């Protein structure tokens, strides 16, 4: 989040986060206005909850596309620089930067792509800065004739009114599959009961039951076991390792 | 030593059939006493798969690594060691490489100086630089016949294995066999062709003949059957 | 298709957007089951009578 | 009625709304011509026997 | 027309905007000003710079 | 553009055309041109919008 130097749009820095507990709260420590608005889950205290893996991409964005960062948008950079697909299930966090990224020296470290003569697939990574041809004729290294640089600097000043200012965001997307789970909230565990009628929790499988010894022959990479009617009928305890 | 040797000569690969290899379970699930149909990349049934022999006619060349690539060899003393993978397999791109020693595994991700015939005799007489290498992983050796099928789908490196023992010198045989989930490996990156290596004793120089098929995979349907334990024991084919 | 999941994943005035149609699909079901019953019950009661 | 001008003329996140409402009232409408033909087919029958 | 109207006034700034939201829960609301999730109403807030 | 006689500094000729197609394919033929600068929209696609 507050790194000293964030990466262009057209080439996008993306981290890895796993094998940890991803404490939220401190999301309300940066400055004030940080957009969140979230696809597929509501941030309002329910991320606590665990997910299988966690990719986090930053870049530097101009107010003139701001919401062109968004599933099933068409725009200057969301067909070009950066594609999230329409069943994206993630959060996007975004604020204002103009106190860091614009200088009176002048930026000129971020640029963004314009000519590529295809569309971007959700999730593309694009790095070649060749000069885009538009014509028949090979542009050889030059300008003019059909031949124009695809990467135009930004220009960030801060002179520029709030609309051209530039805000630093970054995407959070995870997934929630059958898979173990690496990433999970703040929740403190607690003791097992057997052969009782009580609630259960197992990294969100939230639901209501009696829990017994099980001899399913699970396999070591098995998780949890289902029956006929395709409903979780077994399952395996997170820290013992003991199949229920 | 493996710089640039002539001694094979190059022929025309022969051409095999599988008959019902080529199955793994595709999820962490555990069902029983039930049929199950589900779709994902599979090899298709009674799919002819290449053939190639090694030796002292070693056949080491490169291959497409077209969506998923079944393996698998038939011989002793397990001389085949590790496969290595990536676009232009050199040091000016990022390669995946894994390789086998006498007691573990070695899985590195960066940049190599491949040579033309990189082989393990020899310890690491297969590259002779490292740019940075992001992930690194030691586990137990993988250590007639030997079943291995690769997958790299949203960039996790997936690896089924299966070690059944029989003792026969004919090709591959009618039977079934549900390969197992071996690791997960995220690295993030794709790969297009793919290259396997030997333990030859080069220089007498103790030589023997090898063999390993290759088969590549296709999105297809199929009907899964599990008995009353854990096992898979029979698949369907839908669109054969 | 899971409720639990479903309510712990989403806000109050969200969830009830997605509840709807999952209980609106299964009630579909469950009325279908009847009729195909009815029908059968009155063929069974001809072959009966 | 066209669901092409939906997908085209119509933004791809919200649409699937729209596509919904298409094949769910579709959907039903086929589920009410089968039932007919049960009701109309045992009617037959009765006069077939 | 309404039976009653109840009308709560205080002096709260922007940063508690959306701590203090209908149906939307905070550390702070809970312990201040917590609001029904099913409030009906509207809420005015008004520039003291 | 292939007029003799151009217009002043302070006089130029505001001439708007409506109910027609416009090409730009053909004007690109000289070799001349120094600057193309284009503000809001693309140097290409522009036939398509
Ligand atoms: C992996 O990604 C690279 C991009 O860095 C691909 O390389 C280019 O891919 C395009 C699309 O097929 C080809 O037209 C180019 O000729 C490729 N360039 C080179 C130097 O190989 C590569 O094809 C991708 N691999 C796979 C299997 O899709
Ligand atoms: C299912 O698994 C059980 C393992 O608990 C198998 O039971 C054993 O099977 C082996 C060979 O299959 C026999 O030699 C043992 O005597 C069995 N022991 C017991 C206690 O049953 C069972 O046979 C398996 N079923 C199938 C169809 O293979
Ligand atoms: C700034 O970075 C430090 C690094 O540990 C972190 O502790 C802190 O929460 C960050 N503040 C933010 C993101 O507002
Ligand atoms: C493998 O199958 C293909 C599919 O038609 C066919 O060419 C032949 O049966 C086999 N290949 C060769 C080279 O004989
Ligand atoms: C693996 O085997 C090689 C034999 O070539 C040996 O030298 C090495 O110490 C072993 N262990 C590792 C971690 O390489």
Redesign the pocket.
């Given at each position: 989040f507050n790194a000293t130097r964030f990466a262009s749009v057209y080439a996008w820095n993306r981290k890895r986060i796993s094998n940890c507990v991803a404490d939220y709260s401190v999301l309300y420590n940066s400055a004030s206005f940080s957009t969140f608005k979230c696809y597929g889950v509501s941030p309002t205290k329910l991320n606590d909850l665990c997910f299988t893996n966690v990719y986090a991409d930053s870049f530097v964005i101009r107010g003139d596309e701001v919401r062109q960062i968004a599933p099933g948008q068409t725009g200057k950079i969301a067909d070009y620089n950066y594609k999230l697909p329409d069943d994206f299930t993630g959060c996007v966090i975004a604020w204002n930067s103009n106190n860091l990224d614009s200088k009176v020296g002048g930026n000129y470290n971020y640029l963004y792509r314009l000519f590529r003569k295809s569309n971007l697939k959700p999730f593309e990574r694009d790095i070649s800065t060749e000069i885009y041809q538009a014509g028949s004729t090979p542009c050889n290294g030059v300008e003019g004739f059909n031949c124009y640089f695809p990467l135009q600097s930004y220009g960030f000043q801060p002179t520029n009114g709030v609309g051209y200012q530039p805000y630093r965001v970054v995407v959070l997307s995870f997934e929630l599959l059958h898979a173990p789970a690496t990433v999970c909230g703040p929740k403190k565990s607690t003791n097992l009961v057997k052969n009782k009628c009580v609630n259960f929790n197992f990294n969100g499988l939230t639901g209501t039951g009696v829990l017994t010894e099980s001899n399913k022959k699970f396999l070591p990479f098995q998780q949890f076991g289902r029956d006929i009617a395709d409903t979780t009928d077994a399952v395996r305890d997170p820290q013992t390792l003991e199949i229920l | 030593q493996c710089v640039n040797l002539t001694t094979r000569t190059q022929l025309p690969p022969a051409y095999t059939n599988s008959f019902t290899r080529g199955v793994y379970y595709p999820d962490k699930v555990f069902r029983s006493s039930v049929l199950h149909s589900t779709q994902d990349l599979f090899l298709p049934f009674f799919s002819n798969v290449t053939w190639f022999h090694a030796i002292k006619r070693f056949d080491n060349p490169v291959l497409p690594?077209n969506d998923g690539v079944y393996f698998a060899s038939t011989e002793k003393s397990n001389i085949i060691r590790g496969w290595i993978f990536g676009?232009?397999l050199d040091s000016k791109t990022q390669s995946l490489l894994i390789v086998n020693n006498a007691t573990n595994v070695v899985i590195k991700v960066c940049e190599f100086q491949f040579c033309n015939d990189p082989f393990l005799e020899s310890e690491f007489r297969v590259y002779s630089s490292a740019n940075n290498c992001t992930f690194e992983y030691v586990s137990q050796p993988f250590l007639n016949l030997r079943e291995f099928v690769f997958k790299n789908i949203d960039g996790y490196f997936k690896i089924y294995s299966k070690h059944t023992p029989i003792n026969l010198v004919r090709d591959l045989p009618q039977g079934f066999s549900a390969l197992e989930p071996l690791v997960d490996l995220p690295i993030g990156?794709?790969?297009?062709r793919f290259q396997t290596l030997l333990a030859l004793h080069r220089s007498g120089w103790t030589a023997g003949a090898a063999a390993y098929y290759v088969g590549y995979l296709q999105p297809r349907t199929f009907l899964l059957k599990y008995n009353e334990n854990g096992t898979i024991t029979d698949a369907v084919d839908c669109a054969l | 298709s899971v409720l639990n999941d479903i309510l712990s994943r989403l806000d109050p005035p969200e969830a009830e957007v997605q509840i709807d149609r999952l209980i609106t699909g299964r009630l579909q079901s469950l009325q279908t089951y009847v009729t195909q019953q009815l029908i059968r019950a009155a063929e069974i009661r001809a072959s009966a009578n």
């Amino acid at each position: 989040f507050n790194a000293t130097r964030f990466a262009s749009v057209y080439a996008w820095n993306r981290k890895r986060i796993s094998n940890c507990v991803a404490d939220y709260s401190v999301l309300y420590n940066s400055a004030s206005f940080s957009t969140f608005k979230c696809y597929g889950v509501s941030p309002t205290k329910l991320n606590d909850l665990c997910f299988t893996n966690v990719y986090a991409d930053s870049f530097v964005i101009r107010g003139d596309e701001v919401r062109q960062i968004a599933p099933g948008q068409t725009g200057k950079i969301a067909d070009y620089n950066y594609k999230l697909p329409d069943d994206f299930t993630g959060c996007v966090i975004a604020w204002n930067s103009n106190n860091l990224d614009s200088k009176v020296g002048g930026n000129y470290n971020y640029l963004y792509r314009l000519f590529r003569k295809s569309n971007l697939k959700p999730f593309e990574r694009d790095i070649s800065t060749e000069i885009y041809q538009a014509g028949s004729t090979p542009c050889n290294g030059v300008e003019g004739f059909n031949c124009y640089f695809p990467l135009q600097s930004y220009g960030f000043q801060p002179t520029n009114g709030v609309g051209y200012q530039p805000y630093r965001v970054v995407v959070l997307s995870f997934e929630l599959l059958h898979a173990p789970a690496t990433v999970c909230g703040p929740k403190k565990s607690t003791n097992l009961v057997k052969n009782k009628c009580v609630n259960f929790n197992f990294n969100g499988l939230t639901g209501t039951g009696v829990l017994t010894e099980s001899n399913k022959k699970f396999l070591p990479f098995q998780q949890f076991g289902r029956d006929i009617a395709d409903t979780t009928d077994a399952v395996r305890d997170p820290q013992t390792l003991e199949i229920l | 030593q493996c710089v640039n040797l002539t001694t094979r000569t190059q022929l025309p690969p022969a051409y095999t059939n599988s008959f019902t290899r080529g199955v793994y379970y595709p999820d962490k699930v555990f069902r029983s006493s039930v049929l199950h149909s589900t779709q994902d990349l599979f090899l298709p049934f009674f799919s002819n798969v290449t053939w190639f022999h090694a030796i002292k006619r070693f056949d080491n060349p490169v291959l497409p690594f077209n969506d998923g690539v079944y393996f698998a060899s038939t011989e002793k003393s397990n001389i085949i060691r590790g496969w290595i993978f990536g676009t232009t397999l050199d040091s000016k791109t990022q390669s995946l490489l894994i390789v086998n020693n006498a007691t573990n595994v070695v899985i590195k991700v960066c940049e190599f100086q491949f040579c033309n015939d990189p082989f393990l005799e020899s310890e690491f007489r297969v590259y002779s630089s490292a740019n940075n290498c992001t992930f690194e992983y030691v586990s137990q050796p993988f250590l007639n016949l030997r079943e291995f099928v690769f997958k790299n789908i949203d960039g996790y490196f997936k690896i089924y294995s299966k070690h059944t023992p029989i003792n026969l010198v004919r090709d591959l045989p009618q039977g079934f066999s549900a390969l197992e989930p071996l690791v997960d490996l995220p690295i993030g990156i794709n790969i297009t062709r793919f290259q396997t290596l030997l333990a030859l004793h080069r220089s007498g120089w103790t030589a023997g003949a090898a063999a390993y098929y290759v088969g590549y995979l296709q999105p297809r349907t199929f009907l899964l059957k599990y008995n009353e334990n854990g096992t898979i024991t029979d698949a369907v084919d839908c669109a054969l | 298709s899971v409720l639990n999941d479903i309510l712990s994943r989403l806000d109050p005035p969200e969830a009830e957007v997605q509840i709807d149609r999952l209980i609106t699909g299964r009630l579909q079901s469950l009325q279908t089951y009847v009729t195909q019953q009815l029908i059968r019950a009155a063929e069974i009661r001809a072959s009966a009578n």
